Amino acid sequence: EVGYDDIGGCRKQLAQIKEMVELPLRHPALFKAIGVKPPRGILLYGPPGTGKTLIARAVANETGAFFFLINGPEIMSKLAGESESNLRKAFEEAEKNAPAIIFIDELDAIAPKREKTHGEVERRIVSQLLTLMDGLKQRAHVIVMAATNRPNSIDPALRRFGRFDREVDIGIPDATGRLEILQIHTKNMKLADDVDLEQVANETHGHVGADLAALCSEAALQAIRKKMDLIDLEDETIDAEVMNSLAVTMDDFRWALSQSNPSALRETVVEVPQVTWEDIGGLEDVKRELQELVQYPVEHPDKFLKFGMTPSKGVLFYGPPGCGKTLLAKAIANECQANFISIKGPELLTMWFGESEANVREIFDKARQAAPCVLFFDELDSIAKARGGNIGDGGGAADRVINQILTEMDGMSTKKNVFIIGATNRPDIIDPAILRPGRLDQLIYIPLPDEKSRVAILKANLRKSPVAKDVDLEFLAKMTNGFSGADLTEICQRACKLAIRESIESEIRRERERQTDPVPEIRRDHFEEAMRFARRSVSDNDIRKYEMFAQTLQQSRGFGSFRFPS
Amino acid sequence: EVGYDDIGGCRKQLAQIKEMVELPLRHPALFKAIGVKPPRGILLYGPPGTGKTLIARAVANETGAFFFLINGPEIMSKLAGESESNLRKAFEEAEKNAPAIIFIDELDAIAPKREKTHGEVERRIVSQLLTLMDGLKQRAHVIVMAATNRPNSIDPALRRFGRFDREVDIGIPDATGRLEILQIHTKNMKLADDVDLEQVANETHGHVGADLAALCSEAALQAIRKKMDLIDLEDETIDAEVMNSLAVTMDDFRWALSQSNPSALRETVVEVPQVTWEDIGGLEDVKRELQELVQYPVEHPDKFLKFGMTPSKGVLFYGPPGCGKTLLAKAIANECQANFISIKGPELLTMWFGESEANVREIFDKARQAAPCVLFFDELDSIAKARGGNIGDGGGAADRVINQILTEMDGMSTKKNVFIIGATNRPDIIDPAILRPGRLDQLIYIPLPDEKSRVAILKANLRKSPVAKDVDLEFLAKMTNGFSGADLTEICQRACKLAIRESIESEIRRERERQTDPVPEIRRDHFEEAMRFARRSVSDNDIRKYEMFAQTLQQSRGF
Amino acid sequence: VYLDGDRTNSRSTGGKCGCGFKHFWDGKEYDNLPEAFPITLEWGGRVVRETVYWFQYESDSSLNSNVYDVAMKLVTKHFPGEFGSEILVQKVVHTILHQTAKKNPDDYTPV
């Protein structure tokens, strides 16, 4: 049967479920004697296919308590009055065989949003469910677990205390989680020696457990189809000397991956970034500032409360485009081992155009649920830029979205470790209400990269592709003076393209000459040709604005000669 | 059974309910003989989990009256027609066992808003409830109590006179209320010497009674789990002494609090401020004006009646930003022991963008319920500035939210003690309609702090942090000259940050020699270093602006 | 003393003008001569015409012109104490930045 081994991906959520469920079920008498109250309702979030039913079944099997399954559509498909009878019978039967777990599969099908009822028998079913829920006068030990896709798709009457008040969020698996799922689903089949499950796990960006299981099954069936056609003997029984002789190769996995339909691609992704400080050269002062602002409070709270200092909430990055504002946020999120959720400019523009700023509440709720977390708002100026920019439509510097961000930020509890980082390249057009103390007080200037920074960028970009040992990256960084973090990437990509073109041309020429590898690495010639097309993204007439702004900010601090009389 | 002492934060509400219910129940003969109508319906507001079934149960038990409980969902789960039979039987049984109290748990479930309900069976149930409630004129000493979340979630026909006429609002507990709730819930438990419920009560901001009970249970369970795996005392039964051998620690409470999701966090905070006059130095004239305008009418009504002087409706504070306009309002609210409701500028902007100006009415209703109260509007110029500014785009300064504020302030009786205070740092673009003799007639200038006030500001900011005796705040206050409160607090924050960084660095370094409290206070060198980042937020041009505005206002009055 | 742009007894290190001496201007000495740019302000109905003097190619880093200081000084000199004048400051900053852009770093046109 199912167990904890059959579940991959999520690990913290399974730990929380174990903590909440194992003690009251495995120790009935001990909990009865003790005067505390165990939870009597758990609500599992997450998109379909994440394995919520699997989690509930595995917990019930491992604990050993009786497991009774209530299916939403099955309950709602019966006749009026018969559905209520089935629900009551299920509850009383589960109570009789205590301890027990009652799993309501699709709760949003039984008790949807109130405005979406549009009926009477549906409301009667919801009321019957509420009566049965509030009727759990201990009844030895029965735990009711329900699964829903979204928190908003449940009748709010079920959220109150004595009901489904405890919530567990099951998200999209990460790369390690996807690798675990693939290993679980491939442990029974035979793979060829060149199959690297880590590679395919990293390739699948947006996938849930069902998608990965389907991918493995599709690859296995592809191998079976490519093999059995040779033997073409569909005998009475599948003989054992065929499956063993058949192995799935990397080619089949790539073929199945290409013809795959991800289920969750527009879902916001929350995970610890894999970038580090080595990917960005220099900027040591900014690194120290970020460590001071976001790493100290989460690591030494006692020293913060000892001096009675309230930690800051936000930091605003400004500077020319492409200099690595996003990379710094990802690196600082990774260094503290905290979750990172990114909100791009198009998201804010969609909220502004659609006049739906209630999604900001959803964003902040997700950040709160994924604490500790780093919330990164990219190009906050976009809305201000969409309203004419410097020459606006005659109105003030305020909009329905940034104001909602301010409202959510003010009401955000400082005890929880949620840190907000904003990025922009036009500090002049930013709403001054953002820079008010208590919301976003720190301003950090990100200048153009320096020599060591350029060398680090080149090394980081060229890490994946082979290069010739004769290439002198130091001289290339010397040649490049005013480029940004994107021009170097462009140069590297042009060199790679030239190498690829030369390889393909040589291959075609050799094959056409053959009627009766020349380039394994990228050499100096490719970089020499690539540098003939390099272009400075930011002109010398555009950095002067940032330099003058920073100079004005620095020059106003004219109190560096204060000394006590001693 | 449940008793009166089990109730926690809500103390005034319990007093009101006692004074409303004890007399008819304890002395049925007195009220039956006398020609005074006892209350027949009581409605209890408040978000879920605040405790409302508890209060009714406690009142019924203390008064020794029959208590009959009716659940909304329970009555609505029955078949058509059977629900009416259940309601009639409940009312008849309660009438039989006089005196009695009927509690309807989820009133909004039985009788929601009219547009929300669509089926005819639901309307039939609501009409049956109305008929039963109107049939209480027989006076069998039966009192009906109901609970809900919002005043508007109930059918307005249920708030008619003769049915749920009375009203008691139970709100979010305050700091002392939360402390009392924690003490009540931790009576059976055993704590450790390092656990002080007062500190955690201060920290728990947006929690309700159910949230505090959940927090206590989670902390106790975490302690039990932390001890059980080590003791591995998994036997057939549980020993008596093992429970008394374990206690909850402050770390358990900190962990539980950090892993807690408060329910009532978006609700308006209606409490008495803890800010006193000592937190802001100087401005004696402003203190005198505030006491004269908000304290005299609430403590000497006879004087105002005798002289026939209508109390002032409110004032408007104008001045450069960060000079302590909110602190004065909080201090004057605290000095009068009156509730304080603050409405920031983003709230006004949300109401203007979403065109949901009707909520303004609701706000005043809340301020009407918690009288006496001080209603504070921050950044009244935000609406005007957002739609243009000095030039603007279209017509005058009128808009939606400001117009609703005017039409609600005009239609407010002076018998209720609600005082409205507005603040703005751009008095030029404020709507002249507000500055009218009867809405916001008073204009008060809040200038930059003076030498005697900066010392008080620094002391108030530093009272929470250790400071070395060598620090001479007088010299710092003399040297600042042209700073604001928002700059002095920034200086203090930077000094504390430098001290914390030095402590962290020293602690890390001292761990390097371990393979083979250096800074207890804040020295003067920390302040000397932090002063290098000191920036003057308000230039001289802004001072010229405000001084010219005040001079133009003052030059009109000359005699 | 000196009135404006007069030669001063102090050799200019970055003598791009070729004069070889620093020139007096606004109470200080500059290696080069400022560049004049017309500008108009229209705040509060009234219109004021002025010439912004922009300094560039100066050996001293602190002596180079800063737009955020020039615009603020001009606005406070011509419209002192007016509420909400920062919009005028931003407009002047943008106009000066657009007008002073050099396509070739050799178009020195001293007044």
Ligand SMILES: Nc1ncnc2c1ncn2[C@@H]1O[C@H](COP(=O)(O)OP(=O)(O)O)[C@@H](O)[C@H]1O
């Ligand atoms: N984290 C996981 N580890 C292993 N298998 C998973 C995981 N998530 C999903 N699956 C697979 O997906 C399949 C379907 O999941 P399902 O129980 O339908 O999820 P839900 O009920 O939430 O839609 C299961 O057979 C399971 O093997």
Ligand SMILES: Nc1ncnc2c1ncn2[C@@H]1O[C@H](COP(=O)(O)OP(=O)(O)O)[C@@H](O)[C@H]1O
């Ligand atoms: N300072 C930098 N160090 C390393 N890589 C950089 C840097 N700046 C830009 N990049 C490159 O740019 C890409 C992403 O740019 P990004 O940081 O999003 O630009 P912006 O700073 O404008 O947000 C990355 O692939 C990264 O390799």
Ligand SMILES: Nc1ncnc2c1ncn2[C@@H]1O[C@H](COP(=O)(O)OP(=O)(O)O)[C@@H](O)[C@H]1O
């Ligand atoms: N002020 C309080 N004092 C003591 N206990 C409280 C208080 N508020 C809430 N509680 C606890 O919360 C629990 C649930 O409250 P409940 O009566 O369900 O609130 P509501 O009726 O608003 O849903 C009760 O068991 C009660 O012990």
Ligand SMILES: Nc1ncnc2c1ncn2[C@@H]1O[C@H](COP(=O)(O)OP(=O)(O)O)[C@@H](O)[C@H]1O
């Ligand atoms: N006059 C003052 N006295 C003490 N603290 C002040 C003063 N002015 C500002 N502050 C500090 O600044 C913060 C917010 O200032 P606030 O009073 O909101 O500014 P404003 O007067 O513009 O509303 C408070 O935390 C307070 O500690």
